[PDB]
Design a protein around this ligand. Structure first.
Ligand SMILES: COc1ccccc1-c1nccc(COc2ccccc2C[C@@H](Oc2ncnc3sc(-c4ccc(F)cc4)c(-c4ccc(OCCN5CCN(C)CC5)c(Cl)c4C)c23)C(=O)O)n1
Ligand SMILES: OC[C@H]1O[C@H](O[C@H]2[C@H](O)[C@@H](O)[C@@H](O)O[C@@H]2CO)[C@H](O)[C@@H](O)[C@@H]1O
Length: 513
């Protein structure tokens, strides 16, 4: 699908894509290879869909947090720069793009949210979130507002949610999710109260907050370094500072490393490597991008040394040190989707803060909890013996879901033995290659039909049936990847339905004898 002898690059529409196009022209100059830069809407959702069919761009730019998902699905080339090139970037930027011990992208720049304030309206910006309501009352008397920022993307509200204890995944334990704890609830409650008391509007998005700030209508916004060009042009007299504290604690922004990955399906891998190493990640390449939209604190030591002198970069790094680097683990995409929904529903009053963060916690935990139940059932079906290891967190849910599946799953395998044996004998499975192709059939058959617990038990029960065969033919090491792919089919295709059902609690209640 992907054409040979050219480079197609995807980058987000808030970055310096005209700058990047100029590095493209310089590459074409030396090589005769044309470089096309695109900025499609929702490119971070579209990349996995298209790349999975061997389509999409040669090079994808995004914050590192999505790249583990892409690498797990096999959508990225491993990159292998020599030590001399690795030595040119900060080791912590390389750590952001390492997944399962392998480098999966080139790091470009460190991005952290700051408080941006209009110095002609607000000579001393507020140190605390708690003083913002009074400050808004003062500014409303003068025909202005205290603060506007994008309430549609949870990236911008996260720093307040994290301040008093909210977290995605502890230190990374995927079993320990801190989305519906007291600290998260306190942060999101303060946000909702701001909206209730008319200090902010639930509909405010990127464009509205940017237009209000850049015209001098609002004293403050929250945004990253990419936003500074547009403010420069507007001749607002602005500062960039430390985010306000909440309950005496720093705001903790999720820090991104803008990263460039190479599509596994690209026939132009050596061209992409040459472009990124020898054109983009140079003093002149990054300057060309930075002068279009600021990158933040760049990975390339030589150029960071020049930029570090900027007090706006010093404030970006101060917010970065108080926050933490995003995980790159594959459930980051599921975490963001759940938290986005929670913020928008709490802000709009469609749900309470309690309902909203309960559902977000269920959504963030869904893959792990589903794998635990499905993996345990396939293994105990295969061997005749239950797993002794503790169930961990929500162990009650897992144990009861497993006990339910033992009753309802064994019933399906008993009543439909005829068809299950028929299908099994037809597939003639003898190795993990056979199992990988079995996976392909399953996704199609399961997605084709309607959504209910009966069809979900049937998928899992067929999995148990196949697992018993794999043990029988000394292919026991194939059972975990079978559990993984059934889990992936289930939570990818039925996420929203599963969350509406209260995940595996809904399963336990539905079949409660
Ligand atoms: C109230 O409802 C319930 C309450 C409690 C418990 C269960 C239910 C319930 N509720 C609903 C349904 C069912 C049972 O349904 C079946 C039981 C047995 C067989 C089929 C189905 C239809 C069902 O199938 C699936 N459901 C969900 N996920 C998948 S993934 C997958 C699958 C498919 C192929 C693979 F290679 C691997 C996996 C299938 C599947 C679909 C059809 C199948 O056989 C069709 C007939 N063939 C068999 C072979 N023979 C030689 C020719 C005729 C088989 Cl064996 C399977 C496993 C499948 C469905 O689609 O609804 N049960
Ligand atoms: O809103 C959730 C979102 O947060 C981050 O996306 C950022 C991105 O990192 C920045 O470079 C900038 O473009 O704004 C985005 C927020 O709109 C995560 O990187 C992303 O995966 C996640 O969905």
């Amino acid at each position: 699908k992907i054409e040979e002898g050219k480079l197609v690059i995807w980058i987000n529409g808030d970055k310096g894509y005209n700058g990047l196009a100029e590095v493209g022209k310089k590459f074409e100059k030396d090589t005769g290879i044309k470089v096309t830069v695109e900025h499609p809407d929702k490119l971070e959702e579209k990349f996995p869909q298209v790349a999975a069919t061997g389509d999409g761009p040669d090079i994808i730019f995004w914050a590192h947090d999505r790249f583990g998902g892409y690498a797990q699905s096999g959508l990225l080339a491993e990159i292998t720069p020599d030590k001399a090139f690795q030595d040119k970037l900060y080791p912590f930027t390389w750590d952001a793009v390492r997944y399962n011990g392998k480098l999966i992208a080139y790091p470009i720049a460190v991005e952290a949210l700051s408080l941006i304030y209009n110095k002609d309206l607000l000579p001393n910006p507020p140190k605390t979130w708690e003083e913002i309501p009074a400050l808004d009352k003062e500014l409303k008397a003068k025909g202005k507002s205290a603060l506007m920022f994008n309430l549609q993307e949870p990236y911008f509200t996260w720093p307040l949610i994290a301040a008093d204890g909210g977290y995605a995944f502890k230190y990374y334990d995927i079993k320990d999710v801190g989305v519906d704890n007291a600290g998260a609830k306190a942060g999101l409650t303060f946000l909702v109260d701001l909206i209730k008391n008319k200090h902010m509007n639930a509909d405010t998005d990127y464009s509205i907050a940017e237009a209000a700030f850049n015209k001098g209508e609002t004293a403050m916004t929250i945004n990253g370094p990419w936003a500074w060009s547009n403010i420069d042009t507007s001749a607002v007299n602005y500062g960039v500072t430390v985010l306000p504290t909440f309950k005496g604690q720093p705001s903790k922004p999720f820090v991104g490393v803008l990263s460039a990955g190479i599509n596994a399906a690209s026939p132009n891998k050596e061209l992409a490597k040459e472009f990124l190493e020898n054109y983009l990640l140079t003093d002149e390449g990054l300057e060309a991008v930075n002068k279009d939209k600021p990158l933040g604190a760049v990975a390339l030591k030589s150029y960071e040394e020049e930029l570090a002198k900027d007090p706006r970069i010093a404030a970006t790094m101060e917010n970065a040190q108080k926050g933490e680097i995003m995980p790159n683990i594959p459930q980051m995409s599921a975490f963001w989707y759940a938290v986005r929904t929670a913020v928008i529903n709490a802000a709009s009053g469609r749900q309470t803060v309690d309902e909203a963060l309960k559902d977000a916690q269920t959504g963030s935990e869904l893959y792990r909890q589903s794998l635990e139940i499905i993996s345990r059932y396939l293994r105990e079906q295969a061997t005749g013996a239950a797993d002794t290891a503790p169930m961990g967190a929500s162990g009650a849910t897992s144990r009861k879901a497993l006990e339910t599946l033992r009753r309802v799953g064994d019933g399906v395998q008993r009543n439909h033995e005829t068809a299950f044996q028929g299908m099994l004998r037809k597939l003639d499975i003898k190795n993990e290659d056979d199992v990988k192709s079995l996976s392909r059939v399953m996704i199609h058959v399961f997605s084709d039909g309607v959504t209910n617990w009966g069809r979900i038990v049937t998928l899992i029960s067929f999995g148990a049936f196949v697992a018993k065969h794999l043990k029988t033919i000394n292919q026991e090491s194939c059972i975990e990847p079978l559990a993984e792919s059934i889990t992936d089919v289930l939570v990818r295709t039925k996420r929203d339905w599963l969350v509406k059902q209260r995940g595996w609690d809904g399963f336990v209640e539905f079949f409660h004898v």
